[PDB]
């Protein structure tokens, strides 16, 4: 709201309407909104988009966990691999992401998109509230994991100097303390990517095949 000052951020539906969202269901009203996201079907169980790997976000973290090899393959390719399955939950996401940060950059003390340098990397949070001189992060959880946003927010708490933040679910919100030990995920990253070789596959079985096995 303009004119007005926020104290802490609430929980995604309660700020936006999400059933709204929950006819975007069927291949036709997919392929639409697919367009506009740029994520395009690349193999018939296999969706990607462009992404820049100088950026570090959720979809790392959450990839170099799943499988240190997916990352690896998508780094190479300079495309974001997205299963099938959870194409929708990416797009669904996106469009939440984009109206709670429209809606909650609104008031003075918030701000959204705030670009911060990781030295070789960059991040950019979703949302910053400032309460008084302090920037008190908020990490929007969407599409991926509750451990990798959680991680991801954990990166923005130390790099702020932060004394907690905000870990916005759909019907909750959680405060994630400051956690110092979440950037030694960054520098494993950073050599995996550099890596010249790929890394052995962490997971049960490939999604992604032939990709995976190609390179
Ligand atoms: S996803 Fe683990 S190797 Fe393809
Ligand atoms: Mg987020």
Redesign the pocket.
């Given at each position: 709201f303009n004119g007005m000052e926020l104290l802490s951020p609430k929980p995604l539906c309660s700020v936006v309407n999400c059933e709204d969202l929950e006819k975007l269901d069927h291949v036709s009203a997919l392929n639409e909104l697919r367009r506009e996201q740029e994520i395009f079907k690349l193999l018939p169980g296999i969706y990607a988009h462009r992404y820049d790997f100088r950026r570090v976000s959720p979809s790392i973290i959450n990839d170099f966990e799943?499988?240190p090899?997916?990352l690896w393959?998508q780094h190479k390719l300079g495309l974001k691999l997205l299963s099938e399955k959870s194409v929708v939950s990416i797009i669904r996401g996106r469009i939440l992401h984009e109206r709670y940060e429209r809606l909650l950059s609104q008031y003075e003390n918030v701000v959204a998109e705030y670009k911060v340098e990781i030295g070789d990397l960059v991040g950019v949070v979703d949302l910053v509230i400032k309460r008084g001189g302090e920037y008190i992060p908020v990490e929007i959880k969407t599409g991926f994991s509750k451990e990798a946003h959680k991680t991801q927010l954990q990166i923005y708490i130390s790099m702020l100097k932060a004394r907690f933040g905000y870990l916005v679910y759909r019907n909750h919100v959680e405060v994630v303390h400051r956690n110092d030990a979440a950037l030694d995920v960054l520098k494993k990253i950073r050599e995996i990517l550099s890596a010249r070789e790929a890394p052995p596959?962490?997971?049960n079985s490939?999604?992604?095949?032939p990709?995976?096995?190609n390179l």
């Open positions: 799943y499988c090899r997916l393959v596959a962490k997971c490939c999604i992604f095949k990709i995976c096995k």
